[PDB]
Amino acid sequence: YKAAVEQLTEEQKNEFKAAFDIFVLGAEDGSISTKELGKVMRMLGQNPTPEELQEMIDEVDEDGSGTVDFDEFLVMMVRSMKDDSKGKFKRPTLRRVRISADAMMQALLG
Ligand SMILES: [Ca+2]
């Protein structure tokens, strides 16, 4: 979620900006496309196929611009952490309950 991608501290966001900056150092429009993704794969020792690059970008490209921006990159990291929340009960459940009472206070005070 874009809302939960804004529920990350500025220390955490800066650690995701410093990784994304290495991807878009060669980019023109400041967004990760198959050109930057491919050059990064080879730097990591991988040999990706054209299709492999096209599928990885389209999976995390939400706006359909053909590129992955910083807001879209943060959502990928949010999803990586959120999907790894099962099969667990206490930590996920406490986050959802705590968010529920937080929403109830915001409707009253807002
Ligand atoms: Ca995009």
The two three-digit tokens of residue 103, written as one number: 């929403």
Closest by CA position to 80, among listed 53, 57, 60, 100: 60
Answer whether 32's CB lies under 8 Å from 61's CB: no
Of the CA atoms within 13 Å of residue 69, those in its CB half-sphere come to 7
DSSP, res 47:
-
Technique of determination: X-ray
Expressed in angstroms and rounded, the spacing between residue 100 Cα and the centre of ligand 1 is 30
Which residues, 6 or more positions from 70, have their beta carbon under 8 angstroms from its beta carbon?
16, 17, 20
Q: Is 69 annotated as a binding residue?
A: no
Amino acid at 26: G
CB 15 within 8 A of CB 84: no
* Of 37, 71, 74, 42, residue with least CA distance to 57: 37
61 is in an annotated binding site: yes
- Whether 31 has a binding-site annotation, put simply, is no
* DSSP-assigned states of every residue in 58-73: HHH-SS-SSSB-HHHH
Token pair of 94 as six digits: 């406490």
